[PDB]
Amino acid sequence: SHMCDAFVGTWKLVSSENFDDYMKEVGVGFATRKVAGMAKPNMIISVNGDVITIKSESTFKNTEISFILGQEFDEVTADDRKVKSTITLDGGVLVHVQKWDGKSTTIKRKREDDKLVVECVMKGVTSTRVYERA
Ligand SMILES: O=C1C(O)=C(O)CN1Cc1ccc(Cl)cc1
């Protein structure tokens, strides 16, 4: 049903801003921040029926999530948090909320021009990560 069509594909990270500070706010430790911050992941997004799959492949970690919009799931993040996640579409933006230990962070993924822009927010700290088609 052409849900998420403009997101589907293989995307490569081309810029990052404020990611170390976002990771600090989330609680990521020093060594993981350094290695994770170096990574240039590819994000691979696909849809099969109602199921969306987002894979992230990098030299740091490979991650994979599959989900149905609005339906909570378990996620182990790249930094090894065990979180409860819900992903919805809000006005054409994929909004990914992660909950763990009474904390919450939100990752928004949006298409803007030929890029896919990822905004990661923890309390007052935002990181913006820009991906281009691979
Ligand atoms: O899901 C994404 C995505 O498509 C990014 O660019 C950043 N991110 C969150 C994130 C948090 C912590 C670590 Cl260690 C690694 C990634």
From Swiss-Prot:
A motif (Nuclear localization signal) lies at residues 24-34. This is Fatty acid-binding protein, adipocyte. GO terms for biological process: brown fat cell differentiation; cellular response to lithium ion; cellular response to tumor necrosis factor; cholesterol homeostasis; fatty acid transport; long-chain fatty acid transport; negative regulation of DNA-templated transcription; positive regulation of cold-induced thermogenesis. Transmembrane segments: none annotated. InterPro entries: Calycin, Fatty_acid-bd, ILBP, Lipocln_cytosolic_FA-bd_dom. It is found in: Cytoplasm; Nucleus. The gene is FABP4. GO terms for cellular component: cytoplasm; cytosol; extracellular exosome; lipid droplet; nucleus. A fatty acid binds at R129, V130, Y131. The modification N-acetylcysteine is found at C4. It comes from Homo sapiens. CDD domains: FABP4. Monomer. Homodimer. Interacts with PPARG.
